[PDB]
Amino acid sequence: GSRATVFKLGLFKSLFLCSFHDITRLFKNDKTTNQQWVLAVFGLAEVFFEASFELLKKQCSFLQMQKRSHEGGTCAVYLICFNTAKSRETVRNLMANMLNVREECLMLQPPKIRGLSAALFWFKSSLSPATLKHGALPEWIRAQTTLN
Amino acid sequence: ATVFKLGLFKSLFLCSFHDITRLFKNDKTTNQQWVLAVFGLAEVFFEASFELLKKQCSFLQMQKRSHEGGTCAVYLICFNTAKSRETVRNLMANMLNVREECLMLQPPKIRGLSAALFWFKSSLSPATLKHGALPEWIRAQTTLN
Numbered sequence: 073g074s075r076a077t078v079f080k081l082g083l084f085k086s087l088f089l090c091s092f093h094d095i096t097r098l099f100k101n102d103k104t105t106n107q108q109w110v111l112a113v114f115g116l117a118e119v120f121f122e123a124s125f126e127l128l129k130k131q132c133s134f135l136q137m138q139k140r141s142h143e144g145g146t147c148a149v150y151l152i153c154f155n156t157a158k159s160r161e162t163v164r165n166l167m168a169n170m171l172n173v174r175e176e177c178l179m180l181q182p183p184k185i186r187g188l189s190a191a192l193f194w195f196k197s198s199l200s201p202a203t204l205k206h207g208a209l210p211e212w213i214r215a216q217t218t219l220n
Numbered sequence: 221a222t223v224f225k226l227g228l229f230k231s232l233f234l235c236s237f238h239d240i241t242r243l244f245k246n247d248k249t250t251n252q253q254w255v256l257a258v259f260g261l262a263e264v265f266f267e268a269s270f271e272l273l274k275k276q277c278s279f280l281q282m283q284k285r286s287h288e289g290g291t292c293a294v295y296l297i298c299f300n301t302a303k304s305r306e307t308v309r310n311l312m313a314n315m316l317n318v319r320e321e322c323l324m325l326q327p328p329k330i331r332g333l334s335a336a337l338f339w340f341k342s343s344l345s346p347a348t349l350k351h352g353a354l355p356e357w358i359r360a361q362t363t364l365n
């Protein structure tokens with residue numbers, strides 16, 4: 073359980089300088105499946121962030137990961153494109169176990185696939201040397217960030 | 221390649237895997253204490269396994285070494301609950317992101333001075349990862365009575 077709180081949203085915004093709501097859309101039912109997911113994780117240890125990259129690569133067509141932190145806390149964000157569609161219930165169980173964290177430490181919703189500022193969040197992230205990347209960029213990001 | 225695994229282990233750790241373990245021929249026999257050797261393991265998984273095993277063990281001692289011939293990590297694990305080789309094999313292959321053929325598992329040789337001293341010597345290295353109190357069979361054979 074535990075979707076999110078004013079405190080988790082507040083920390084995300086203080087670190088990434090934009091709302092978690094501006095890069096995702098809403099799935100109110102925990103059973104609806106989807107290949108693409110946006111994941112935010114608070115209080116994650118570095119060794120598990122790095123191990124998750126190698127493990128997700130084997131079941132994904134695309135993956136982009138980054139992390140930030142300051143005196144108030146830490147937050148890692150993932151754009152995941154699974155080879156097979158999964159529900160929030162399933163992804164929640166997979167990632168809490170994989171990352172060695174409580175479910176309350178996560179926030180999960182599918183991506184906002186229409187909107188230029190939303191597509192530029194990922195394009196900007198792909199320009200950092202620290203970002204971990206795997207696979208070909210999703211067409212919805214490529215199409216909105218190209219043509220002049 | 222078992223003949224070559226054994227050779228790599230001795231080359232790196234200075235003694236034979238057979239001299240620090242005893243034999244369990246049946247993969248279903250359960251036991252709390254296990255000795256594990258892993259070949260070709262990545263560093264990030266070695267470190268992550270220390271944090272995950274602490275959660276279900278009363279004692280743990282781990283080491284990892286390498287050279288142009290290859291890499292090997294050795295573990296003395298004391299689980300809270302007794303487990304069979306089948307069960308430990310499945311657990312660790314998945315935890316470490318390696319094929320089961322990359323592991324060697326047997327219970328420890330609990331009687332013999334040279335075998336107890338392998339663990340005592342390992343505990344003196346600053347590189348060794350440790351958790352919990354040393355097993356009584358090691359403490360008793362390596363202390364002046």
Ligand SMILES: [Br-]
Pocket residue numbers: 073074075076164178179180
């Ligand atoms: Br969630």
Ligand SMILES: [Br-]
Pocket residue numbers: 081082085091092093
């Ligand atoms: Br917000």
Ligand SMILES: [Br-]
Pocket residue numbers: 097098
């Ligand atoms: Br919506």
Ligand SMILES: [Br-]
Pocket residue numbers: 098099100101104
């Ligand atoms: Br829904």
Ligand SMILES: [Br-]
Pocket residue numbers: none
């Ligand atoms: Br929708």
Ligand SMILES: [Br-]
Pocket residue numbers: 106108182183185
């Ligand atoms: Br989508």
Ligand SMILES: [Br-]
Pocket residue numbers: 114115144145146147
């Ligand atoms: Br935090």
Ligand SMILES: [Br-]
Pocket residue numbers: 097183184185186
């Ligand atoms: Br949308």
Ligand SMILES: [Br-]
Pocket residue numbers: none
């Ligand atoms: Br549409």
Ligand SMILES: [Br-]
Pocket residue numbers: 187
């Ligand atoms: Br909009």
Ligand SMILES: [Br-]
Pocket residue numbers: 192193196
């Ligand atoms: Br921008």
Ligand SMILES: [Br-]
Pocket residue numbers: 210211212
């Ligand atoms: Br797409």
Ligand SMILES: [Br-]
Pocket residue numbers: 323324325
């Ligand atoms: Br074995």
